[PDB]
Ligand binder design. Structure first.
Ligand SMILES: [Cl-]
Ligand SMILES: [Cl-]
Ligand SMILES: [Cl-]
Ligand SMILES: [Cl-]
Ligand SMILES: [Cl-]
Ligand SMILES: [Mg+2]
Ligand SMILES: [Mg+2]
Lengths: 142, 144, 145, 143, 144, 144, 144
RNA sequence: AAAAAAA
RNA sequence: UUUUUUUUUUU
RNA sequence: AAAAA
RNA sequence: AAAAAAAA
RNA sequence: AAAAAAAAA
RNA sequence: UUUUU
RNA sequence: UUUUUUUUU
RNA sequence: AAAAAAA
RNA sequence: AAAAAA
RNA sequence: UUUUUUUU
RNA sequence: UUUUUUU
RNA sequence: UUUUU
RNA sequence: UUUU
């Protein structure tokens, strides 16, 4: 129940600024019928302990409708991946079966497409009948 | 394996945490003077140079030390550690000496589970004594 | 036996849908080659209504294969070379195949490793093609997205 | 392997620049109260589905969900009547909602013997519902 | 095992390639200043001194460094490495310090599969930081 | 697998070699006249077109030959090879004929280990005889 | 597998029946008044909308009821069922309430084998009570 | 459990 | 002496 | 482990 | 078999 | 050697 | 088989 | 088992 | 029933 | 799979 | 796991 | 009797 | 141990 | 669950 001696040897290999696999929850404002390019710079912030990083490797993206849909409609949200080497045209869509329930959808970036992205890049486009969308992006900060 | 994006059938919104915890080993040096103990400040662990400037408390698990500069002429390197705690400072002097004058001296101590509480910047980790002018510290701790 | 009438499906909540999905394909098309000159194969040749792929703007190429489409010059055997090109760096390989019969095509291909399987848009080039035949047929196993 | 490799290709293989592709096409239709709407097959051929290069398709199963809220005091329902060129059906596969804020779903599978092609002028099924829109998901084989 | 030349019943003409690929690790040195990070150019990997002057692109897999000269007086040698990528530079600082003043300081990093693309001579591999004036690098790569 | 860079706990400086060896299959053609033996030079292996302009010697292991052009009228293609050695030329005539006028002829020989020494550019590999005016050679050798 | 018509080696003329028995699950709705028990007529099961207009009798096996419309304000939906038999009505009130105001209420009962006799249009199946103005009934029954 | 049939 | 569909308790 | 159909 | 990077 | 055709008599 | 320790 | 279609050594 | 084999 | 300790 | 190999 | 890539 | 499923 |  007390301190014990450690027989430390040579000075090991160190790294003061290591990588960090994180999950960053943040929201975006969306206009109806209009696509919103989610910026990668939203992941670098003191609010996420990640303002010290300049690049990140996104592994997967997911989205949830943060506000209620227009009256008489069910919530929906689409996600279109974006890459510097070539943007995609897939519209991964998820719709709510209950008007009072969020709509969820996401996608996974293949290993061959997991490169670095800086604050000036864009993750994906977002289309929804709701005015805000909550995202939880699984990415590797480095 | 997959060569293109695939769809994830995500369900309800999960539990999230934008500011989680982080177990780390922080390498930083402190300046030690001959025949004198240096109280290692916990505030040296919160810094943008370790990505931990967003933390205000930390749970230290184990401290290790290495002499960073050469010892005085005709002497071998040594380094001592005295664990400090807010509920009561220790009187142990975990000493490690170098058997070669050109080689570092090293020593460390592990903090028991019953003594692993958070520490703020105004707190201190341990006292350091060495015949060298600088000591390299590697502290394994949990930031929260 | 099999069911001979329409049967009810007990569907549940609305699922996750995607109207514009991906497509792993093997696209055949031809290119014209001159003698002693290398022709850069454009990625835009993969996007056409003749392949049902004019809706795609990007594509991840996995492997390329080539065949000589026309007869070689007199007394010669057909050959063809391929030089992989990437936006991060052009290779210098010249994967060559020669026909052992003057009446037979020459063939060769190259596979792209998973680390170099990024996307390429229409303005990009897949590879360079050299041959003594005035036309080469290309079959490119790729993943449209 | 972190580099390009050589493929020892042989003879020229059989090629097809325009294959068939099996899909699940999502789209919506407008429905009136008391009136049955015929779903055209031509909706399956669109640039929004990457299928504007197709002229025929083999339908296998149809699924329907109510896309808007039902009238006041009611629960959502939806009915599907299959239609064929060899002869229309009289079935009305119906699904109702046990919650007013929740959709209603129903579907039907087309057997193997009735899985022939259909062109844009044809119709898939008749849809009835109390909601003013219905979301359809049709598992079909284009060719 | 045989003592004479023997015939080879060859068949059709094979698939050939006069300019193949090559898996190498290139030993070369760079000059480092105090308190300054030096960017390692990729064009150092292409030279007639390594039989690689015929390539223009290269896929780097892992980098390792060693201090090529002695550290300043009273200091132990150290070396840092910060990986750089055309899609996004890293902020890591993989450091290696020597426990003996007369011994080199070594450290290295590995590039994951999803980041192993080609690099041309204008590109840069990583930054180097060391108290020694020269550093020896061995860059395991794949010339193509 | 992994998705980010990882530290390598490198140790002592390894044994390096900037100019290594290379086992290669070199393809190249030679122009042959009817009824005349052409001595294939070893200097044809050392070329920038083969990334081998940095070598001066090579250890040949096996030689294979293919007729590159069509044979004269009414004849079938044939090709011969006579192995040459600086310690003594051989008199073998390894011949391969085609069973089809449109098809190449092919033959090859393997150099035994006891006769696998180095050859410089001024040396010759073998003599080629053919009714076709060009012959394609694929030589398996070890550059050093 | 078979792609053409095949002959059937039939025999004697079999036993036939142009109007066979049919067992069904009939979905129909009834209007209910608050505080008033509605007697469900069997004549609602005989209709062209169920392909059962040709039948004159039916053996009811089990009944299930759902509230078809929304409940009053500040109330949860409920529905009660009292089985009715020509040999003697019951006094049971199988009741089911909704735990959510937006969710239907549901309850049903099964008729024992000894009580599964035929019923004509002038007969009644059960009484329904609900705070909702319509009830959706699904009756499993054998038409004969 | 209920509808072709089969020696 | 051997099956496709309307509901359907129980292992 | 060597040759010559 | 092959110099290079690794590795109880 | 898929169907149609005598039967293990 | 034929020619070789 | 045989006559024609398709599969597989 | 669609991508690269089917030994 | 990361970061750390064994 | 990159280039050459060994009895259809 | 190898298996790996979106409905 | 947190994260992401 | 730790001072030859
Ligand atoms: Cl709402
Ligand atoms: Cl290159
Ligand atoms: Cl050649
Ligand atoms: Cl013989
Ligand atoms: Cl103890
Ligand atoms: Mg030819
Ligand atoms: Mg032949």
């Amino acid at each position: 129940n007390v301190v014990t001696m450690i027989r430390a040897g040579s000075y090991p290999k160190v790294n003061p600024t290591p990588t960090w696999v994180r999950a960053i929850p943040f929201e975006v404002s969306v206009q109806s019928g209009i696509a919103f390019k989610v910026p990668v710079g939203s992941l670098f912030s003191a609010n996420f302990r990640t303002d010290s990083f300049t690049s990140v490797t996104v592994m997967s993206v997911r989205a949830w409708t943060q506000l209620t849909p227009p009256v008489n409609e069910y919530s929906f949200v689409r996600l279109k991946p974006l890459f510097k080497t070539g943007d995609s045209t897939e519209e991964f869509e998820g719709r709510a079966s209950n008007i009072n329930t969020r709509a969820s959808v996401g996608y996974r970036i293949p290993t061959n497409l997991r490169q670095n992205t800086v604050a000036a890049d864009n993750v994906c486009e977002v289309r929804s009948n709701c005015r805000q969308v909550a995202l939880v992006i699984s990415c590797c900060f480095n």
